[PDB]
């Protein structure tokens, strides 16, 4: 050797409260803590006041991440009417970006990285709520697959694409979409300019856009060559299962404006706490 320098605790129930008596002495001060160390206070209830033996049988299963995310939520509403300007040709291409509704978005913004599987549910209804015997076709378009330009296109042959033939008189179809992200987990917040070279003002749209969360398009159409006389409104519901979370973040107290970047209104900024008249009145 010529060179020398080159050589989890399972808590199914809550914690019980043990009995304690009065204390009189110096040197021990469980009340006085230091908040400048970045740590929470480790003081308990028995070290300050007199407590009794309390057997705590309260369960902590509702506070788990899996039970908090196993409830379905509305993520997208696709309107395919007969009259209008947007999707009157008989087909509708919806890009897969689950940021359009603020009920399930605030749950996903609680954590930074989240690896999970999802369960999609597609409910078909008319704009007035009625139902007609109409045949509907779903299709999943991953990035790299051709997008259809009509209802009789070659992309609706669906050789390798997943497709669900459902009817409006049928129950809603449930599928299980797996973890399709190329990274280890989904990244809800991307910090930095992902492009290369010198960044200009016209290329400022690419901020906060990660390619790992872009799953492509979701295309629907009416099965047939002729146009259907009935308007079709589709609602997508995602159920999160087998969820692992990392790096918790503060929630948002501001109303959402855009789904691309978390912008907020500058003139009207609503406070988190409810205001009152005086600090000494109640």
């Amino acid at each position, epitope marked *: 050797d010529p060179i020398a320098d080159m050589i989890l605790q399972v808590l199914p129930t809550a914690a019980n409260t043990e009995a304690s008596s009065h204390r009189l002495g110096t040197g021990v001060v469980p009340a006085l803590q230091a908040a400048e160390t970045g740590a929470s206070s480790n003081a308990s209830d028995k070290n300050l006041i007199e407590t009794r033996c309390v057997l705590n049988h309260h369960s902590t299963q509702e506070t788990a991440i899996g039970n908090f995310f196993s409830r379905a939520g509305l993520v997208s509403i696709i309107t395919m009417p007969t*009259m*209008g*300007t*947007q999707n*009157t*040709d008989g087909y509708a291409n919806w890009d897969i970006d689950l940021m359009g509704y603020a009920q399930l978005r605030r749950k996903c913004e609680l954590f930074t990285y989240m690896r999970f599987d999802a369960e999609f549910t597609f409910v078909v209804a008319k704009p007035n709520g009625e139902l007609v015997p109409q045949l509907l076709q779903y299709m999943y378009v991953p990035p790299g697959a051709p997008k259809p330009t009509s209802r009789d296109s070659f992309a609706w042959q669906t050789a390798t694409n997943p497709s669900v033939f459902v009817k409006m008189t049928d129950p809603p179809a449930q599928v299980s979409v797996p973890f399709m992200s190329p990274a280890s987990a989904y990244q809800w917040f991307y910090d930095g300019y992902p492009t290369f070279g010198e960044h200009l003002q016209a290329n400022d749209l690419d901020y906060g856009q990660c390619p790992n969360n872009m799953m492509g398009t979701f295309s629907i159409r009416t099965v047939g060559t*002729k*146009k259907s*006389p009935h308007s079709i409104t589709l609602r997508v519901y995602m159920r999160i299962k087998h969820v692992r979370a990392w790096i918790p973040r503060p929630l948002r107290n501001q109303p959402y404006l855009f789904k691309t970047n978390p912008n907020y209104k500058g003139n009207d900024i609503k406070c988190t706490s409810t205001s009152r008249d005086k600090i000494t009145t109640l």
Partner: antibody, heavy 121, light 108 residues
Framework: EVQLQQSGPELVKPGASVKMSCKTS????????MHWVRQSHGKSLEWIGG????????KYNQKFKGKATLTVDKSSSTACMELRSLTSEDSAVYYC??????????????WGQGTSVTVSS | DIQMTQSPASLSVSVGETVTITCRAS??????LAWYQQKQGKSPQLLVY???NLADGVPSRFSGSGSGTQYSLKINSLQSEDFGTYYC?????????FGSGTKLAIKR
């Protein structure tokens, strides 16, 4: 109450391009769609395509997809079109008119003046 | 593409007789029909939309009726200013197609 004025008749050579205009007033331009209807010899009618002028929305024909583009300026109330790779059979009059509120159906009541465009060398 | 065929191509009749022109589409368009009147060197004007309701500036002499694929347009009574070609337009399938045209002349 609604008057649609087009550009003047221009004589162009085959191989070049042309650009017309359709200026109108009397109504809200951003809330009503527009269409373009050509009339070849003798009485045959075709449909170029529709345009919903909010930001950008165009419904192209399957035959005239690559030979016609529709642009809308939001400052002045006008509608301009552009054609590429003109030939002898593309010499016909062009019409412009206002459609329906937020709809491509409910066909046009008030039409344009019909500026004739001829292609000859 | 849903094509339309009008019959007849040209019909000449005098002033004071009923004129019945027909418009027929290859597929069902669900009563989405229009009617135009183009004079010599003039812009066309809408006569009756959706085959039951006439537009503004249109008199009560023009009355259209029809359902399904086959349609009709009845003119009673005919005047001297109603001469010109007539077209029909569908609102069902993109692109919209027009008829072949029906010229109305004066019988002598």
């Amino acid at each position: 109450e609604v008057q649609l004025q087009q550009s003047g008749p221009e004589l162009v050579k085959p191989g070049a391009s042309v650009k017309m205009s359709c200026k109108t007033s009397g109504y809200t331009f951003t809330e009503n769609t527009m269409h373009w209807v050509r009339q070849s010899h003798g009485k045959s009618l075709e449909w170029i395509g529709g345009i919903y002028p909010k930001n950008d929305d165009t419904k192209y024909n399957q035959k005239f997809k690559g030979k016609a583009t529709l642009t809308v300026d939001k400052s002045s109330s006008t509608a301009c079109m552009e054609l590429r790779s003109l030939t002898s059979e593309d010499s016909a009059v062009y019409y412009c008119a206002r459609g329906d509120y937020e709809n491509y159906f409910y066909a046009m009541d008030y039409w344009g003046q019909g500026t004739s465009v001829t292609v000859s060398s | 593409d849903i094509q339309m065929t009008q019959s007849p191509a040209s019909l000449s009749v005098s002033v004071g007789e009923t004129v019945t022109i027909t418009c027929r589409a290859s597929e069902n368009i669900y009563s989405n029909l229009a009617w135009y009147q183009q004079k010599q060197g003039k812009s066309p004007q809408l006569l009756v939309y959706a085959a039951t309701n006439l537009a503004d500036g249109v008199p009560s002499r023009f009355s259209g009726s029809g359902s399904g694929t086959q349609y009709s347009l009845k003119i009673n009574s005919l005047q001297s200013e109603d001469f010109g070609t007539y077209y029909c337009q569908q609102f069902w399938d993109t692109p919209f197609t027009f008829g072949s045209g029906t010229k109305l002349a004066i019988k002598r």
